[PDB]
Nucleic acid binder design. Structure first.
Ligand SMILES: [Mg+2]
Length: 800
RNA sequence: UAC
């Protein structure tokens, strides 16, 4: 029901001086006053409402507001520093915007006690409405100055991404509680928007046209479908605002609509003819389709040449890899650089001279918060082979030189399928590839004995299944099929579909591009996934160097949801199947569109418990549950349902079975940044904090059990420390034990010899759902059937 | 193949 209080403050690890992008706020103790606004029409966008309120305050200045500067949230709530002279009773007013008349009623609703909040920060376990009030106050002005996106703000600076897209720089701002004081979280952000250009040029940039003069013919269906999928849902505006709901198949010269003549009779009329009659405009490009806007019952069609893409539209649809890369190159910068940019941002914002921040007596410190962090000692890693070499993670990174796999799978029989055109990928390529791969393999501890028994060329996904159907039937004990493919191709999905869901064979693909030039590290990293794909163990945590939670049987779960770019959401939960913990088992379900809550969690947890008991012959006395990607506002419901789901999964097994459940939420999408005070502590060109820095003081929840942990070594840009919030804990973990455990689990990721940002279970869950995505593409019964995995595939970490 |  309620998250546990904080048990203790972690004392383990080596102390480090840090600075967090949290800026202390001096909050007065006075009572803010809360008024409610009912504006009609009631479905106006927040910006219009803000303009209405502005003009309202400036208009009724004489009898209502006076010299007071109230702050507005864009919806229905208006706050004032000192009370409005209206009393309890509701007042109605009219506000005219320069041609429209708005009826705005204002009635006093409540009082916001800043003292209650102040005291909550000091042992009176926190009012959300007060924090939200402060938020409104702090972001009243930037909301009117810039383009608000969630808790961020953006503007237009000439930073093309291509695709009709652009880069907008801005910032994130959020009022946040912390022990004792109120913090202002300020970070530099940037996101993708759509350019303010004519739809013609949009078509040009989407279909790679240098000019609209080319393609002097009607569009390929191929093209229409792409442009349709690009512009659908976007707002346009007439050059003489509408919402594009569809794109016509027929050109503007032939696309018709029911036109009512003055006699009353209706006759079908072409868009071109209508624009020639009504607007005296002859379409220059009548061969091009139309944009169906508004209601589909309205039958409203607009030619492309008379529409412009409305400025300020954030790009939500998934970015291409090149666009994403460009975004990275434009946004990524070292930690000191980002810190300086946040400083310039604070200087530019100048909260202390803000009329509204002044009005409410709020004051913001210009210095980042001094926080003392602790670099946790990393776990050693035990490898196998003759040596049984122990590797020590230096800066969250280690290697496999003079090291073999823990239990390297002896590869005797295996096949090679190349879908690469043989001109591009030739016999000698395959030979040098298998040669190099074998040397690196023997050096890795997973010996691929003998040349490949099978090795053939093929093309088209249509031939994937039967080829496999042949292999499994002609080679006894066939362990692995190495599939070679060039560039983007749906054959990967087919190979994964048949391989994981149909026949149950381990498949390891390589890009054709990476076949010809082989680097020892690439091949080694390939073997890392190949070994775990065959059920082997690459490496384990040092047994003696582990938290006491491993004293009695414990299962580690990792859950995540993934949402579609009608298409269902994918829920994925994985569980540890040994005591290392290395090998994991996977469960995956399809569920309601954009439903974050794992609906069928109980069945999955039950299934994982069953597999655990089958693999270890033990009933886990403790269940550790790492939940990914849950907003701070969705906590109570996801906890209420999923905790009861795990509990019910335990009860459905046995009446007496009640293991301790630790419900933890891992957040990676936040704006908490940590910087090194001493330049001697900076690591790499990024200048980031080292791998293992843990912050559970100062900027963390005043009462609850939460902590920041930066388990990964920043390679590029500024590191984002993973936040962990303990929603439940029957096991009564200490801060040190839980933080160390969470840190050590980040070293159990098998796809790389380095510490990752989030623990292996959550990452694995993400991989499972991401694989289910490819399992889908190729009614609920059929989907759940297509996502289900072959039983022989099930034991093994196929998602690796 | 591995933010
Ligand atoms: Mg997720």
């Amino acid at each position: 029901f309620k998250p546990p209080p904080r048990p203790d403050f972690g004392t383990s690890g080596r102390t480090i001086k840090l600075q967090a992008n949290f800026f202390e706020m001096d909050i007065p103790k006075i009572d803010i006053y809360h008024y409610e606004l009912d504006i009609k029409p009631e479905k106006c966008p927040r910006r219009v409402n803000r303009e209405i309120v502005e003009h309202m305050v400036q208009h009724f200045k004489t009898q209502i507001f006076g010299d007071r500067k109230p702050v507005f949230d864009g919806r229905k709530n208006l706050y004032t520093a000192m009370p409005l002279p209206i009393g309890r009773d509701k007042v109605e007013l009219e506000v005219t915007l320069p041609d429209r008349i708005f009826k705005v009623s204002i009635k006093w609703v409540s009082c916001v006690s800043l003292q209650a909040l102040h005291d909550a920060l000091s042992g009176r376990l926190v009012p959300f409405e007060t924090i939200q009030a402060l938020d409104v106050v702090m972001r009243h002005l930037p909301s009117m100055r810039y383009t608000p996106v969630g808790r961020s703000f953006f503007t237009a600076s000439s930073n093309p991404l291509g695709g009709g897209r652009e880069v907008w720089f801005g910032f994130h701002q959020s009022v946040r509680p912390s022990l004792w004081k109120m913090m202002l979280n300020i970070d530099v952000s940037a996101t993708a928007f759509y350019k303010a250009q004519p739809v013609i040029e949009f078509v040009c940039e989407v279909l790679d046209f240098k000019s609209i003069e080319e393609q002097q013919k009607p569009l390929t269906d191929s093209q229409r479908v792409k442009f349709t999928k690009e512009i659908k849902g976007l707002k346009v505006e007439i050059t003489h605002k509408y919402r594009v709901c569809n794109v016509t198949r027929r050109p503007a010269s032939h696309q018709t609509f029911p036109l009512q003549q003055e006699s009353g009779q209706t006759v079908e009329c072409t868009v071109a003819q209508y624009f020639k009659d009504r607007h005296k405009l002859v379409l220059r490009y009548p061969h091009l389709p139309c944009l169906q806007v508004g209601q589909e019952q309205k039958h409203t069609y607009l030619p492309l040449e008379v529409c412009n893409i409305v400025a300020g539209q954030r790009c939500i649809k998934k970015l291409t890899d090149n666009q994403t890369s460009t975004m990275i190159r434009a946004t990524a910068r070292s930690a000191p650089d980002r810190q300086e940019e946040i400083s310039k941002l604070m200087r530019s914002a100048d909260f202390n001279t803000d009329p509204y921040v002044r009005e409410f007596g709020i004051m913001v410190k210009d210095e980042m918060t001094d926080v003392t962090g602790r670099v946790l000692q990393p776990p050693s890693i035990l490898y196998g082979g003759r040596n049984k070499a122990i590797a020590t993670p230096v800066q969250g990174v280690w290697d496999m030189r003079n090291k073999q796999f823990h239990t390297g799978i002896e590869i005797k029989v295996w096949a090679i399928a190349c879908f690469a055109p043989q001109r591009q990928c030739t016999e000698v390529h395959l030979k040098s590839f298998t040669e190099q791969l074998r040397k690196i393999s023997r050096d890795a501890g997973m010996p691929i004995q003998g040349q490949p028994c099978f090795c053939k060329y093929a093309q088209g996904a249509d031939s994937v299944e039967p080829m496999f159907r042949h292999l499994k039937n002609t080679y006894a004990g066939l362990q692995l099929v190495v599939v070679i493919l060039p560039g983007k191709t749906p054959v990967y999905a087919e190979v994964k579909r048949v391989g994981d869901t149909v026949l149950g064979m381990a498949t390891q693909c390589v890009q054709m591009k990476n076949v010809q030039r082989t680097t020892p590290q690439t091949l080694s990293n390939l073997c890392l996934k190949i070994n775990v794909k065959l059920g082997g163990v690459n490496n384990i945590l040092l047994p003696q160097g582990r938290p006491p939670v491993f004293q009695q049987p414990v299962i580690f779960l990792g859950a995540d949801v993934t949402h579609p770019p009608k298409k269902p959401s994918i829920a994925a939960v994985v569980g540890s199947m040994d005591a290392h913990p290395n090998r994991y088992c996977a469960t995956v379900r399809v569920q309601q569109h954009r439903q974050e809550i794992i609906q069928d969690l109980a069945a999955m947890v039950r299934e994982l418990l069953i597999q655990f008991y089958k693999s270890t012959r033990f009933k886990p006395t403790r269940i550790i549950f790492y939940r990914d990607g849950v907003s701070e506002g969705q906590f109570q419901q996801v906890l209420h349902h999923e905790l009861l789901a795990i509990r019910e999964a335990c009860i459905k097994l046995e009446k007496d079975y009640q293991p301790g459940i630790t419900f933890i939420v891992v957040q990676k999408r936040h704006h908490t940044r940590l910087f090194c005070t001493d330049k001697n502590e900076r690591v790499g060109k990024s200048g980031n904090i080292p791998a293992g820095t843990t912050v559970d003081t100062k900027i963390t929840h005043p009462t609850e059990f939460d902590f920041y942990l930066c388990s990964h070594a920043g390679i590029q840009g500024t590191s984002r420390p993973s936040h962990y919030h303990v929603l439940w804990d029957d096991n009564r973990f200490s801060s040190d034990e839980l933080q160390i455990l969470t840190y050590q689990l980040c070293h159990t990721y098998v796809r790389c010899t380095r510490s990752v940002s989030i623990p292996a279970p959550a990452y694995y869950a993400h991989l499972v759902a991401f694989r289910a995505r490819y399992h889908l593409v190729d009614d609920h019964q059929a989907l759940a059937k297509a996502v289900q995995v072959h039983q022989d595939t099930l034991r093994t970490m196929y998602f690796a």
